[PDB]
Every structure is written in C-alpha cells, then in structure tokens.
Amino acid sequence: KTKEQIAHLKASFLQSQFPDDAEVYRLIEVTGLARSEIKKWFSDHRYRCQRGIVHI
Amino acid sequence: KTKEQIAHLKASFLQSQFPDDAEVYRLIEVTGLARSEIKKWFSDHRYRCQRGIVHI
Fold this sequence. Notes:
By secondary structure, the first copy, chain A, is an all-alpha fold. In chain A, 79% of the residues lie in helices and 0% in strands. It is classed as transcription. The entry lists the keywords ZHX2, corepressor, homeodomain, domain swapping, Structural Genomics, Oxford Protein Production Facility, oppf, Transcription.
C-alpha cells in the first residue's frame, strides 16, 4: 500500500476522534460532563489509540 | 465517571472506525483499494486501537 492510500485510511479512521463542537455539545447534554472534561478524555484516548497502532 | 457517561464517549470516539458503505465507496474512489482490502485494514486498526486503550 502506498503512503497516499494509507493517508486516506487514517484520515477516515480518525474522523470521530476529533469531534466538532456540535458533537461536543451533543455529548454534554447526554453525559453532563464539562467541555474540558470531554476534551481531556478524547485527547487521552487518541494518545492511547495511536500508541496501540504504532507499537503493533 | 459513570459507565453511562463512558458509553457515550466510546460510542462517539468509535464512530468512524465502522465506515458505512457510502464512506467505503468514498475510500475506494480516493484510494483504489478493494472493498475487502479496506475492511481488513480498518478491522486490523480497530484491534490495535482497542489494545492501546486497554493496555495503556
């Protein structure tokens, strides 16, 4: 697989790890968590997800 | 943090790791990879992601 097509797969795979603020709002109203609470969670899970992908 | 809250965050985070076949269509026409080749890549990267999240 070329670097290009791998770039497209990651882009697509990672979309929902960077929620837009409509999605963050949606999360606030279903979770009751603070915006920054939600943000910290996502950032942390991205870090762990990527460390999973890189190690394997 | 409750199990309910974590469920909403997880459901959101994992969204784009299960591309619907409009998304996969978009990937075919942007990567030239087969439907099955795209599915195997995602599944593999779902596994690596979750192991990262589970073990870190």
